[PDB]
Amino acid sequence: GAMAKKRGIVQYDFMAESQDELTIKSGDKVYILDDKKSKDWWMCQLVDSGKSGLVPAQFIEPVR
Incomplete structure (x- = not known):
């Protein structure tokens, strides 16, 4: 539902x-x-x- 938590892991450093x-x-x-x-x-x-x-999309691995 709309409170589902969606986890990721950062794969690269990023400086805003x-x-x-x-x-x-x-x-x-x-x-x-x-x-x-x-x-x-x-x-x-x-x-x-x-x-x-905001972070670059290609830097985040969706995980469970």
């Missing part, structure tokens, strides 16, 4: 340039909040901190 982006390190665990609105960017939430923002 804009405020809407999320700095991430390879191996970081995330929740995938929105993989539909943008073609090349997903809105993710870090499991350690709750900090959220």
Whole structure:
């Protein structure tokens, strides 16, 4: 349902340039909040901190 949690693992480091982006390190665990609105960017939430923002789509491995 609409509260289903969708997990991912970060595969590459990424340093945000804009405020809407999320700095991430390879191996970081995330929740995938929105993989539909943008073609090349997903809105993710870090499991350690709750900090959220856009990350390159191809950097996130969806996992269970």
